[PDB]
Amino acid sequence: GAPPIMGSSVYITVELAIAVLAILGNVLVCWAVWLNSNLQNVTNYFVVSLAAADIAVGVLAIPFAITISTGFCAACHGCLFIACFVLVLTQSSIFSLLAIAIDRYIAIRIPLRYNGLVTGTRAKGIIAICWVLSFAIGLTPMLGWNNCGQPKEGKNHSQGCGEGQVACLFEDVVPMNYMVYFNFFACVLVPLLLMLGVYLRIFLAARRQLADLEDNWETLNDNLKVIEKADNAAQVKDALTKMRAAALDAQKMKDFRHGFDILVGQIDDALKLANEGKVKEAQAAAEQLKTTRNAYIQKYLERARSTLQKEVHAAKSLAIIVGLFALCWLPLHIINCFTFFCPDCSHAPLWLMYLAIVLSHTNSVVNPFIYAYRIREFRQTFRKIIRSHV
Numbered sequence: 474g475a476p477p478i479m480g481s482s483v484y485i486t487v488e489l490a491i492a493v494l495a496i497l498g499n500v501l502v503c504w505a506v507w508l509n510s511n512l513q514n515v516t517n518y519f520v521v522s523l524a525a526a527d528i529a530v531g532v533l534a535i536p537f538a539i540t541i542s543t544g545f546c547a548a549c550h551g552c553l554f555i556a557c558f559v560l561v562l563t564q565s566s567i568f569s570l571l572a573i574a575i576d577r578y579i580a581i582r583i584p585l586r587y588n589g590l591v592t593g594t595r596a597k598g599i600i601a602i603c604w605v606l607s608f609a610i611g612l613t614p615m616l617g618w619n620n621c622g623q624p625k626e627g628k629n630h631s632q633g634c635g636e637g638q639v640a641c642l643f644e645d646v647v648p649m650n651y652m653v654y655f656n657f658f659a660c661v662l663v664p665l666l667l668m669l670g671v672y673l674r675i676f677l678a679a680r681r682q683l684a685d686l687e688d689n690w691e692t693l694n695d696n697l698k699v700i701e702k703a704d705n706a707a708q709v710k711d712a713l714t715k716m717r718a719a720a721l722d723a724q725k726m727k728d729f730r731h732g733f734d735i736l737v738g739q740i741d742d743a744l745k746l747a748n749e750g751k752v753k754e755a756q757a758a759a760e761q762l763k764t765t766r767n768a769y770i771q772k773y774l775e776r777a778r779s780t781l782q783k784e785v786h787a788a789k790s791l792a793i794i795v796g797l798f799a800l801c802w803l804p805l806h807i808i809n810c811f812t813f814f815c816p817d818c819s820h821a822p823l824w825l826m827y828l829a830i831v832l833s834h835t836n837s838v839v840n841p842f843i844y845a846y847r848i849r850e851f852r853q854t855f856r857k858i859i860r861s862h863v
């Protein structure tokens with residue numbers, strides 16, 4: 474076979490290229506949030522936590538990956554730390570993505586409560602806690618769930634390791650039951666499914682809000698036409714009672730209020746006339762409603778639609794991030810599943826292991842590109858930083 478160093482040179486070169494790009498792109502993210510107070514919100518605190526995890530992939534995880542590819546002799550607990558540290562960063566990523574999804578879910582479901590439920594001070598606490606949990610989950614093998622007690626003597630002697638040392642190779646020291654049941658099923662796949670569920674609920678909530686606006690609008694307009702071709706007070710009375718309900722629902726910032734005050738007032742004026750039997754005065758009063766609608770209500774309606782559309786677009790953008798996370802990490806997990814559940818199967822070849830590893834690391838490059846393409850405030854801040862400071 475070809476000298477191993479030839480394939481190793483390609484591996485190391487690609488890992489270093491990923492490292493540089495992971496560091497540069499994610500530093501730009503952090504720099505942008507620092508510069509631009511418009512980007513300084515709780516959602517972006519999680520973005521910065523995720524960018525920090527991606528910088529740490531370039532600075533630490535990639536160097537550790539290069540090291541462990543050599544099978545160097547190491548004390549088994551030192552080997553575990555180098556093998557498992559990337560699991561801490563990946564777990565931190567998962568918590569940041571989960572926090573973002575729930576943040577956007579609260580923002581769309583209880584917008585009035587959001588700013589008092591979800592504060593910077595609480596966010597910072599949540600981020601600290603998530604990082605501590607990430608260290609505990611990813612370094613669980615250091616607590617004894619490891620293969621350090623069952624060393625590969627063949628490898629130890631061939632690499633000529635000293636006493637207490639192992640040839641530091643991932644699948645020799647990290648148990649596959651940990652990787653499949655604990656890391657993959659419990660710590661990765663369950664959070665990804667929860668995130669899928671939350672995004673689904675976001676899109677369902679936006680659509681139901683947009684439906685309710687459009688139904689209130691159409692209720693207004695249709696009862697306006699009922700009133701016009703009406704024949705008696707009872708008809709006009711009913712159509713106005715329906716308009717009043719529709720109007721109060723639509724309502725649930727000074728110029729906005731004034732507009733609905735004019736509407737409900739005009740409705741209530743036409744309501745008192747109807748009761749007293751004056752059908753034509755009620756019908757005439759109701760013709761006023763059309764200019765209030767055109768001047769005030771159609772403006773609030775289109776503003777509300779435009780806000781919801783922006784929330785849906787932002788939610789799509791963040792869901793893309795989760796989808797790319799999944800794309801980049803699932804191959805390695807699926808390979809581990811074959812290793813573990815199919816002992817009759819040939820192990821995935823080395824070249825495929827290293828491709829899957831490289832793909833996992835490429836995840837730490839992509840997010841700054843998604844922000845730049847999808848989120849105008851990031852794109853514009855990146856432009857300013859690049860022009861001015863380069």
Ligand SMILES: CC(C)CCC[C@@H](C)CCC[C@@H](C)CCC[C@@H](C)CCCC(=O)OC[C@@H](O)[C@@H](O)CO
Binds near residue numbers: 489492546555
């Ligand atoms: C990637 C680049 C663009 C940016 C990187 C930035 C800088 C700061 C990287 C820092 C790298 C270091 C943290 C790397 C640590 C390397 C360690 C893990 C090597 C360990 C090797 C070792 O133990 O020696 C081998 C022998 O001692 C062994 O065989 C016997 O014990």
Ligand SMILES: CC(C)CCC[C@@H](C)CCC[C@@H](C)CCC[C@@H](C)CCCC(=O)OC[C@@H](O)[C@@H](O)CO
Binds near residue numbers: 477827
């Ligand atoms: C995020 C997504 C939208 C795009 C990501 C792009 C992905 C596919 C990365 C592209 C890189 C590849 C085209 C090149 C990688 C080739 C490497 C993995 C070959 C590995 C060779 C090998 O087996 O070397 C290691 C061993 O031979 C042994 O010597 C240990 O070092």
Ligand SMILES: CC(C)CCC[C@@H](C)[C@H]1CC[C@H]2[C@@H]3CC=C4C[C@@H](O)CC[C@]4(C)[C@H]3CC[C@]12C
Binds near residue numbers: 547548550551554
């Ligand atoms: C501020 C940052 C850069 C500090 C980085 C510290 C890192 C590189 C240190 C902390 C713990 C260290 C490990 C401690 C124990 C061992 C076992 C030994 O047999 C081989 C080296 C090895 C595996 C060390 C490699 C380097 C190491 C991983």
Ligand SMILES: CC(C)CCC[C@@H](C)[C@H]1CC[C@H]2[C@@H]3CC=C4C[C@@H](O)CC[C@]4(C)[C@H]3CC[C@]12C
Binds near residue numbers: 800808819
């Ligand atoms: C998430 C998206 C990108 C799908 C990726 C699926 C990948 C991970 C799948 C596609 C086909 C799969 C391979 C098909 C056959 C074998 C041979 C078996 O003896 C070891 C596992 C191995 C090598 C599988 C590992 C995982 C694999 C490479």
Ligand SMILES: CC(C)CCC[C@@H](C)[C@H]1CC[C@H]2[C@@H]3CC=C4C[C@@H](O)CC[C@]4(C)[C@H]3CC[C@]12C
Binds near residue numbers: 810814
């Ligand atoms: C995509 C997300 C939502 C689900 C992930 C599906 C994973 C867990 C599935 C997809 C394909 C599956 C593999 C398909 C084939 C085999 C070979 C069999 O001898 C053992 C089970 C094994 C190795 C399966 C294990 C579980 C597996 C890897």
Ligand SMILES: Nc1nc(NCCc2ccc(O)cc2)nc2nc(-c3ccco3)nn12
Binds near residue numbers: 643652806826
């Ligand atoms: N299975 C696996 N192996 C490795 N590296 C070792 C690749 C390899 C596997 C077999 C071999 O004989 C020589 C090298 N890194 C790995 N990282 C992960 C991982 C991280 C998150 C999910 O899986 N899994 N994983």
Ligand SMILES: CCCCCCCCCCCCCCCCCC
Binds near residue numbers: 478481482485486542
């Ligand atoms: C992109 C900057 C330069 C790229 C680095 C060149 C790669 C050569 C280093 C070779 C060292 C090999 C160490 C042992 C590997 C054996 C693993 C089986």
Ligand SMILES: CCCCCCCCCCCCCCCCCC
Binds near residue numbers: 601604608
């Ligand atoms: C908001 C700043 C980020 C906070 C990061 C601090 C993390 C400190 C290290 C975590 C300690 C947990 C120990 C559990 C694993 C022990 C295994 C030997």
Ligand SMILES: CCCCCCCCCCCCCCCCCC
Binds near residue numbers: 793796797799842843
């Ligand atoms: C298994 C699910 C994975 C599906 C991937 C979802 C991503 C869709 C891509 C469309 C939008 C991408 C915007 C910019 C792409 C830049 C990529 C570096």
Ligand SMILES: CCCCCCCCCCCCCCC
Binds near residue numbers: 487490491835839
């Ligand atoms: C070998 C390094 C892999 C880096 C691959 C990262 C892909 C990022 C997408 C960039 C697309 C830019 C398109 C501009 C027109």
Ligand SMILES: CCCCCCCCCCCCCCC
Binds near residue numbers: 601605606
């Ligand atoms: C920053 C304050 C300390 C955080 C306290 C974390 C609470 C941990 C509760 C149970 C630990 C479960 C870890 C799984 C091994």
Ligand SMILES: CCCCCCCCCCCCCCC
Binds near residue numbers: 605606609615616
């Ligand atoms: C054989 C080396 C084992 C070292 C483990 C000692 C540290 C105890 C871990 C406590 C974890 C607390 C984290 C908060 C959940």
Ligand SMILES: CCCCCCCCCCCCCCC
Binds near residue numbers: 814815
């Ligand atoms: C999302 C579905 C996840 C469940 C996958 C569990 C698969 C277990 C595979 C059992 C294989 C045992 C091998 C027997 C020869």
Ligand SMILES: CCCCCCCCCCCCCCC
Binds near residue numbers: 804819821822825829
């Ligand atoms: C990065 C994940 C996608 C990899 C696509 C390549 C699939 C080819 C798999 C063939 C491997 C068969 C080797 C078994 C001996």
Ligand SMILES: CCCCCCCCCCCCC
Binds near residue numbers: 503506507525528532
């Ligand atoms: C409000 C913006 C603050 C930016 C914080 C930057 C944190 C960077 C930590 C990266 C750690 C990698 C080693």
Ligand SMILES: CCCCCCCCCCCCC
Binds near residue numbers: 521522529597
């Ligand atoms: C704007 C507040 C966000 C602070 C997040 C910073 C996270 C830094 C953790 C560094 C751990 C890297 C090993």
